[PDB]
Amino acid sequence: APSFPFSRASGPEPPAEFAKLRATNPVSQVKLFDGSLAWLVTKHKDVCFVATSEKLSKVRTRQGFPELSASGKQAAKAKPTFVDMDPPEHMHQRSMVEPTFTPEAVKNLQPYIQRTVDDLLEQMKQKGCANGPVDLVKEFALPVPSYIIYTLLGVPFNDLEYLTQQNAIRTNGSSTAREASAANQELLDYLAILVEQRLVEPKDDIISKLCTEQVKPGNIDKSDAVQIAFLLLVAGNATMVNMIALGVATLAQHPDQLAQLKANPSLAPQFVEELCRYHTASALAIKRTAKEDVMIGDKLVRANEGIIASNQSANRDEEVFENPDEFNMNRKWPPQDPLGFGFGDHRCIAEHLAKAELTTVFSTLYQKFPDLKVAVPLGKINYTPLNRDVGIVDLPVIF
Template sequence: MTEDGVPGAPAFPMPRTCPFSPPREYAELRAARPLSRVTLQDGNTAWLATSHEYVRTLLGHPATSANRAHPGFPATVANVQAFAQKGFLLSMDQPEHSLHRRMVAAEFTVHRIRQLRPRIQQIVDDRIDALLAIETRPVDLVRELALPVPSLVICELLGVPYGSRDVFQGHTEVLLARSSSPQQRQESFGALRAFLGDLVTSKDGDPDDDLLGRLSVKYRAADCYDHELLTGFAMLLLLAGHETTASMISLGLLALLRDERLATQLTDDPTLTPNAVEELLRYFSIVDYPTARVALADIDLGADRVRAGEGFVASAAAANHDGDVFADPATIDFRRGVRGHVAFGYGVHQCLGQNLARAELEIVYDTVLARLPAMKLLTSPEEQPFKEATVYGLHSLEVTW
């Protein structure tokens, strides 16, 4: 962060005035000055990068820190220091980050996720069976499908016992529900961390063949076992992998319901689904401004310099709607080549779980289109209750068929 009171620095975060577009200020800033000063919620200022080139340059620069506890880290969300707890890879710097990322990376390879796909398919089919069994309409797809699927997949990954999954999902639902009070969220956060801590303990003496069990064995073999770190990693997987995937499930389905042409393309040619997932990730860019850092040395970009100790935000949504890289970026085009989007971040902190997220989205979109071809919205897409939060998404998505 820089000193308070930079004249003319616009407020950040900037609201989305249209549910299907990033803030209009991003395009204006990118055209005029792709590295600009903005005023954060705490009154301090930071740099905002809005071009694809600058975003990738900054996120890939070695002289930056992701440590949320660093005094210069930009406060894009309230209580940003809470994300600096032990086990949160997104807040680690080198060499600690590489050490722990290497320990867990094998759990999220393309091969490992391919092995998990049949189980993800079963989870999605079970949720749609439950959807079809609901006799009253409308049905909220967020509550009945988008939120439960990633929760159950995470249960599968972590090795949560079947008898405890209702407790796990119950706390998760409170943590993410729009109607929950701050106190209820805080209580559920504490209960989930305690639950996951007990789960890690249960793997210590008799590790199962699941993610936490394998990590327990691996860390002990490396003589660097840390119970609190594994608990924090499990909590990060829940927080980072749950709401993001749930939001992309609901927003992607909204896009398909909004435009019959898009749904028909996937129905006629399911081989397009992986491309469709990448394009929807680019288009919605739901994790926009958590890609923040603090400079550890001076970084020159064009005529500007981010000085050591200053914070910056590398906007994913702005980069993914840069017309110099993505032609006609405001249009969803499943046949677009979308290599280079930064929906999963960029550089050493690129999302560890991106292969898992892709698998969940591909399976959900294909299965919904195949099993619920008559599904339709009850209200216009523009009337949907969108949430302006750290992760952009929908509070609910009511449909009928």
């Protein structure tokens, strides 16, 4: 059994292993860092099965759970939030914060999302680049999702820049173990204060709603509110930043489609759909342990055995998406759901918000900067470690 996670073939490419597995061994065993084994699912149909099977669990205290790293095993000890819960606990807590993320709520949030993007682009414009290139990530990809989630949670405007920087340190590759944890602990400390404040004087934000609707009635306690808010912050920020960066690099990679997007920003929604399929920036979250024996394909996964379902591989499944390795914003979509945001009960709570942010970004970015260009040969782009989720660390641009 090969060691997993696999390493991406190249900077922007998915691991080479998946294609081969989908064709010759769709359901196989891989070896994890601690030597334990797990079943790796690579076909779209099987990934969907794993994501929805009631015979599988997300509880990490169950023996056999596929932890992919030393730290993962440690994190599994703390009290769990809905991300690691099975029904009915899962929705009992998730429904506590779902209102802000419904399709309707997000549609009503559009103007706010637009102004957040406009202001960041304007500040990046006046800041100019007359003395050289600027980092699109630091100046744009990072603050867009950061300010929005922080604002929705209840963070005041003046604290956004500092908190955005601290949250970045949390996952930054250059950060030392000490720097990462301190930034992490600091964010938790800040959230604790916000909860205390909103418990006293509630405002129109997520933290205040948890405080009034769950904490006060005694449904959850303060630390719970802090952890739930923390999850909403760290769960998808790094991914959002990587998706925006990856989007810009991809458009530079395919000039003709960038030409098309500029000419018709109305194509943004479909460009975002193809981007979330082509670049599956979160491919290691659909994990489970079998509660009882379950047959998947030609294999029998026995009780207490772990399973990793690659939504990244599923998104390149040639049986579902024709010419899967071709990025095409004008792609003819099949009836099957691309899985950039997972599937089933646990499907990304912020899928609609994430798409709205991305759609706003790519329907506006080139309108503001028609001549935006990556200020460095594409083959030299600084991507994330090949053994981690796909993404871009920094992206020098000129406009």
